[PDB]
Amino acid sequence: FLKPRLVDIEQVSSTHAKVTLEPLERGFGHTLGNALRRILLSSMPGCAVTEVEIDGVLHEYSTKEGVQEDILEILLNLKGLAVRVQGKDEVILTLNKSGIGPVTAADITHDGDVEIVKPQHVICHLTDENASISMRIKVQRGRGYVPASTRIHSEEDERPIGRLLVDACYSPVERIAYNVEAARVEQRTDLDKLVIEMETNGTIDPEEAIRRAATILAEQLEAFVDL
């Protein structure tokens, strides 16, 4: 079997990109196609705010006299926030704001490692001026979808009534499909090109991700070579 190799990886936007491999064989474009999609949809280094301890709010079923949206909804907008990190596997930010206005993903105490993909993402609005809201945002990095429900056995003892915990959804990808077509090599019976389309929230790079996929698939080759 003549080995495959990557041709130019089509980097067009931070949101979506397309990795492409030319030397694929008869039917392996379909073969590795669905195979890697499972990979890119399960084992993926994602970031997700997990703990949001609040200044005055005790439970996410309250409304700080000054904030616009309910606190629970503001926390779902935090689930809707896309951020990538670089070194820290655990980091806390600090939203410091007071004054009428839509608070986008810029006003937060932006750490060096913390890096928002789109700082224009308004999280919540403020309707009062003298409304001092300070909240610590504990975001960590893991993989897959991990709910606080499955983590409630340990619980880490949350006696302190200020701890609000939302779902840790470490999911970068969003919409994956792969483009199969006749590889236009000049001397071979047949080969296949694969332009793997990957939609992202905008946090993990294509080639970085595929080498990780190969690494995960590397572990997955171990046992089957040694029965």
Binding site: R37, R38, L41, S42, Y61
Partner: protein, 52 residues
């Protein structure tokens, strides 16, 4: 404040009643009954990953 201070009398004898609220989020899982307005019914067998 009048309503707040003396409007707490509930039942003769037991004038002190402590009512506590317990919010519990319940999700969708293998076994829930989903349907449509049109009349079609259904119960989720195995909620598979979006991979499939």
């Amino acid at each position: 404040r009048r309503k707040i201070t003396q409007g707490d009398d509930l039942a003769p004898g037991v004038l002190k009643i402590v009512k506590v609220y317990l919010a519990v989020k319940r999700r969708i899982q293998p076994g829930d009954k989903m349907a449509g307005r049109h009349g079609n019914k259904g119960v989720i067998s195995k909620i598979n990953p979006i991979e499939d």
